Ligand binder design. Structure first.
Ligand SMILES: CCCCCCCCCCCCCCCCCC(=O)OC[C@H](COP(=O)([O-])OCC(O)COP(=O)([O-])OC[C@@H](COC(=O)CCCCCCCCCCCCCCCCC)OC(=O)CCCCCCCCCCCCCCCCC)OC(=O)CCCCCCCCCCCCCCCCC
Ligand SMILES: CCCCCCCCCCCCCCCCCC(=O)OC[C@H](COP(=O)([O-])OCC(O)COP(=O)([O-])OC[C@@H](COC(=O)CCCCCCCCCCCCCCCCC)OC(=O)CCCCCCCCCCCCCCCCC)OC(=O)CCCCCCCCCCCCCCCCC
Ligand SMILES: CCCCCCCCCCCCCCCCC[C@@H](O)O[C@H](CO[C@H](O)CCCCCCCCCCCCCCC)COP(=O)(O)OCC[N+](C)(C)C
Ligand SMILES: CCCCCCCCCCCCCCCCC[C@@H](O)O[C@H](CO[C@H](O)CCCCCCCCCCCCCCC)COP(=O)(O)OCC[N+](C)(C)C
Ligand SMILES: CCCCCCCC/C=C\CCCCCCCC(=O)O[C@H](COC(=O)CCCCCCC/C=C/CCCCCCCC)COP(=O)(O)OCCN
Lengths: 57, 459
């Protein structure tokens, strides 16, 4: 009683009912390094200007 | 300080918007008025300074130099009026522009609260002088002279810049007040020795130091009269002013490092005074006399005692005035005889008696006759040197004797004796020349009445 699969059926993406657990770390990665501080604030004018040599602004 | 800087800047559009035959009158009048305004900087304090702003400050060392700089421009214009007669209006305006730019740079240099700003203006003064020398000089050597006057200067000044920025990378500032208040001793190290040399050599070359004085005779001889006046009166004093400012960070290393320069100056004053005795050119003799006087000023600054500093300030002012007068007298002779050879035109007393009186008074002030400010500075420096070491008196007295000898030799050769027979184009002295001579000499004899105005901040 076997019916031959039609064109376009064996190439389908199907779902699998499995009871095997999903690997939590399949890549065996290390812990990612901590990011840079990402400072935030509200801008204020540069103190006493550019402070480059004799320039007062 | 802007109440002096802005009018000096306005001198330029006024010069360039003037009539073709009003440039000299307008320039002279407004430069005299600027001098009169600048005369009010002389009201100095016994305390710190006249700190106008973050950029400019005045001091009783800076104020006499500023007033002399402002006073020199009208005299330079009066001296230049004669030999620029046959030249186009645009070129005369350019010449006056060069003089005005030189005054502006000198004024900003002498106040210059910042050391880098001081360096920038102190090197910006180089360009107008070089253009004046190499454009409106007469002989073919002027170009060569200009080259010397350029490269010597830069050969000294390029290391200084490096040193300067290095200091600000360590101290954090180059403001003179902060430097003075936060000064610290220099340890005896090779790095500190080379920092000392980089700080000193730039100002030493423009005094000039005896071994480094080759550029001065060329530059002063080949320059026009205004160029010679500004070179001898103000530009030579930039080195002394810079040393007086910068020696505050060089202690106690100055005690050891001063010896070669002290020996060079003490022997070179004798050498240059002796050179003056055998000179066939008036301008070269006056230039070598300037070298001797600046050698004495170098000794005074290196000793770094209160009397040394007062004498050096007084001598700088007096030498500026006297050398400008001497160059003007030489140029009055030259514009008649066109030779600049001292032995050629002789016995000019019998033909120009008032000019002979001017020659006599100029020689007397160069000779350091008391109670002139020339002798005030001379004696203060000599006493400080005697306290430094009693053996300096031999060299100092020998220098005094040779100075008197060559001054009176210069007077006798040109004014006394018999007139040269074949020279018949010696015209009577103009009112312009006599006025120029009086405007040189009355300030000296009038400053001898109030010496504290030119004795500096340690008075
Ligand atoms: C050349 C000049 C041509 C004319 C230019 C006019 C302004 C000149 C400013 C130049 C400096 C610019 C600057 O950076 O200023 C900041 C700063 C001054 O700002 P500040 O101290 O806050 O101003 C004080 C005023 O009293 C406070 O002034 P204020 O805030 O009341 O401003 C009113 C405004 C008034 O506006 C007008 O009057 C317009 C009509 C003119 O100012 C002016 O126009 C008059 C000046 O300048 C410096 O830090 C030092 C600069 C030193 C020179 C630059 C370094 C090189 C020196 C040689 C250069 C050579 C160049 C080639 C030759
Ligand atoms: C001594 C007391 C005097 C009191 C009277 C007031 C005199 C005021 C004079 C002010 C400065 C003169 C301006 C200089 C340019 C001369 C103008 C001119 O061409 O004359 C045309 C006029 C008309 O003659 P001319 O026939 O048409 O011309 C024909 C030829 O020119 C041919 O003319 P010449 O052959 O007759 O020669 C012109 C005459 C004039 O030419 C000059 O050589 C005068 C400049 C000499 C000084 C050289 C620089 C050395 C540093 C001395 C600094 C002292 C200044 C004190 C403060 C002055 C304030 C401005 O030269 C001389 O005769 C050689 C005199 C050598 C004197 C050397 C001694 C110096 C130290 C004396 C003591 C000073 C401190 C005293 C402290 C203790 C006492 C309180 O002749 C005169 O009027 C003669 C001028 C007066 C003779 C000055 C001799 C002493 C005055 C020293 C300065 C003031 C002393 C203050 C103490 C008062 C107490
Ligand atoms: C032709 C023959 C002679 C005829 C004339 C006869 C008369 C001669 C008299 C004049 C000379 C004699 C000397 C006597 C001096 C008397 C006046 C003197 O005593 O006053 C001086 C005063 O004069 C000044 O001190 C000196 C003048 C300053 C000179 C400034 C130069 C002018 C600017 C020009 C540009 C600068 C070029 C140089 C740059 C450095 C000193 O006074 P002082 O005891 O102290 O205090 C003043 C009064 N107080 C007490 C109220 C304060
Ligand atoms: C030419 C016209 C004039 C131009 C300007 C002339 C002025 C420049 C003179 C330079 C000032 C002095 C330079 C060095 C002074 C240091 C003291 C030295 O002379 O004494 C001895 C120094 O010993 C020897 O000198 C070592 C160096 C030897 C090599 C130097 C070359 C000698 C002649 C070079 C002169 C050429 C000058 C021009 C170069 C282009 C003491 O030895 P020591 O107590 O243990 O070490 C002291 C230094 N410490 C403490 C920092 C460690
Ligand atoms: C009229 C012509 C004269 C030509 C110039 C004369 C002046 C020469 C002075 C030296 C020039 C450069 C000096 C450097 C400027 C100052 C900087 C400084 O002091 O820093 C020193 C650096 O010192 C140096 O590097 C000096 C090296 C000099 C190399 C060039 C030599 C030039 C000729 C040397 C012989 C002649 C010296 C005196 C000549 C006088 C003029 C005749 C220490 O800093 P650090 O090293 O970072 O700290 C120490 C711990 N690491």
């Amino acid at each position: 009683g076997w019916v031959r699969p039609d064109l376009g059926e064996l190439s389908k993406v199907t779902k699998v009912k499995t009871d095997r657990p999903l690997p939590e770390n399949p890549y065996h990665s290390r812990a990612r390094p901590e990011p840079n501080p990402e400072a935030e604030g509200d801008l204020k004018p540069a103190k006493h200007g550019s402070r480059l040599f004799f320039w007062t602004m | 300080m802007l109440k002096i800087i802005i009018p000096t800047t306005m001198l330029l559009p006024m010069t360039w918007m003037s009539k073709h035959n009003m440039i000299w009158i307008n320039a002279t009048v407004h430069s005299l008025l600027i001098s009169l305004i600048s005369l009010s900087l002389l009201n100095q304090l016994g305390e710190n300074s006249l700190n106008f702003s973050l950029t400019f400050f005045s001091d009783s060392l800076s104020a006499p130099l500023l007033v002399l700089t402002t006073w020199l421009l009208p005299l330079m214009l009066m001296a230049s009026q004669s030999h620029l007669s046959k030249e186009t209006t645009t070129r005369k305006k350019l010449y006056i522009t060069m003089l005005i730019l030189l005054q502006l740079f000198l004024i900003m240099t002498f106040t210059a609260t910042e050391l880098i700003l001081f360096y920038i203006l102190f090197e910006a003064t180089l360009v107008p002088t070089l253009i004046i020398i190499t454009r409106w000089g007469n002989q073919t050597e002027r170009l060569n002279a200009g080259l010397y006057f350029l490269f010597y200067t830069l050969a000294g000044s390029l290391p200084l810049l490096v040193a300067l920025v290095y200091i600000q990378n360590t101290t954090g500032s180059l403001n003179f007040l902060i430097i003075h208040y936060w000064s610290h001793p220099l340890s005896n190290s090779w790095s500190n020795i080379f920092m000392w040399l980089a700080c000193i050599m730039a100002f030493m070359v423009k005094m000039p130091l005896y071994g480094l004085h080759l550029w001065l005779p060329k530059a002063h001889v080949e320059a026009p009269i205004a160029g010679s006046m500004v070179l001898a009166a103000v530009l030579l004093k930039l080195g002394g002013y810079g040393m007086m400012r910068i020696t505050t960070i060089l202690n106690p290393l100055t005690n050891y490092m001063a010896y070669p320069f002290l020996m060079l100056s003490m022997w070179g004053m004798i050498m240059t005074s002796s050179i003056c005795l055998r000179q066939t050119d008036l301008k070269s003799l006056i230039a070598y006399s300037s070298v001797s006087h600046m050698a004495l000023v170098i000794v005074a600054i290196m000793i770094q005692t209160p009397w040394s500093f007062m004498g050096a300030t007084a001598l700088m002012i007096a030498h500026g005035l006297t050398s400008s007068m001497l160059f003007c007298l030489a140029n009055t002779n030259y514009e008649r005889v066109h030779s600049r050879t001292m032995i050629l035109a002789r016995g000019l007393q019998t033909l120009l008696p008032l000019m002979a009186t001017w020659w006599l008074v100029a020689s007397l002030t160069n000779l350091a006759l008391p109670p002139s400010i020339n002798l005030i500075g001379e004696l203060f420096i000599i006493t400080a040197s005697f306290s430094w070491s009693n053996i300096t008196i031999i060299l100092m007295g020998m220098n005094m004797m040779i100075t008197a000898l060559y001054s009176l030799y210069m007077l006798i050769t040109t004014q006394r004796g018999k007139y040269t027979h074949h020279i018949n184009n010696i015209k009577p002295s103009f009112t312009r020349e006599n006025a120029l001579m009086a405007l040189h000499i009355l300030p000296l004899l009038l400053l001898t009445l109030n010496p504290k105005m030119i004795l500096g901040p340690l008075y």
